[PDB]
Structure 1
Amino acid sequence: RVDQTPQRITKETGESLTINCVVRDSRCVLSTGYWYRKPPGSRNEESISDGGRYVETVNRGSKSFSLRINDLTVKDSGTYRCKPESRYGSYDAVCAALNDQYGGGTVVTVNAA
């Protein structure tokens, strides 16, 4: 299972937010994780990358990974999902399937300045 928290959150312009994902009840080894955002009113998600305002943290031992976004603006509103990547999926078809398992999402609204 991939447990994503929080489920929904509102923030003010200029605040930071953190989203967490943990892989529970799995034999797989976490290598890394990826993040995506769908803007409000769209179906289509696109990737986010570590760098600048975006700070990613991976904890292999706890099988968790997290995204912090600093200096939020209304442009950061949307629904975010995480996606884990297993370390040894090439050897284990169950863990290869982990690479396609997304968190349940976080619906984020950032209030105007």
Structure 2
Amino acid sequence: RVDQTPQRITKETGESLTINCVVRDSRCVLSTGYWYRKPPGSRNEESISDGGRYVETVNRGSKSFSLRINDLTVKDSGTYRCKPESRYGSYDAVCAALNDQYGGGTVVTVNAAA
């Protein structure tokens, strides 16, 4: 299980936001992680990753990872989910299943500028 917070975020144009994911598993490690955004009004989520306004942080020791988005605009609104990557040498079925899990999501609303 992957615990994603906050569940919902409202921000003004120009601000920043940060979303956290923590892997609640004492066995499996956190190798890296990924982020996806579903636009308002659609079903399909597409990758977001480190670069430019997007700043990713992975903390393997805490089994957490975070996405910061700077200089927000209305175009950043949507539902964001994280997905962990937990690597292993030989096959481990527990950790294999963790690699298919997503966070519960964060619904982001960025209000227009005035």
Q: Gaps (5+ residues) in structure 1? A: none
> CA 1:104/1:90 → structure 2, altered by over 3 Å: closer, same or farther?
farther
Measure, in 2, the Cα distance between the counterparts of 1:64 and 1:75: 26
> CA 1:18/1:64 → structure 2, altered by over 3 Å: closer, same or farther?
same
Asked if the contact 1:89/1:95 (under 8 Å) is kept, the reply is: no
Measure, in 2, the Cα distance between the counterparts of 1:77 and 1:13: 10
Q: How many residues align?
A: 113
- Aligned sequence identity (%): 100
Q: 1:89 deviation in Å?
A: 6.7
> What SS is found at the alignment partner of 1:30?
coil
Q: 1:87 deviation in Å?
A: 2.2
TM-score (norm 2): 0.95
Q: 1:90 deviation in Å?
A: 4.3
Asked if the contact 1:17/1:70 (under 8 Å) is kept, the reply is: yes
Q: 1:49 deviation in Å?
A: 1.2
Measure, in 2, the Cα distance between the counterparts of 1:104 and 1:55: 20
Q: 1:25 deviation in Å?
A: 3.2
Measure, in 2, the Cα distance between the counterparts of 1:2 and 1:92: 18
> What SS is found at the alignment partner of 2:37?
strand
Measure, in 2, the Cα distance between the counterparts of 1:43 and 1:6: 21
TM-score (norm 1): 0.96
> CA 1:8/1:30 → structure 2, altered by over 3 Å: closer, same or farther?
same
Q: Gaps (5+ residues) in structure 2? A: none
> CA 1:89/1:38 → structure 2, altered by over 3 Å: closer, same or farther?
farther
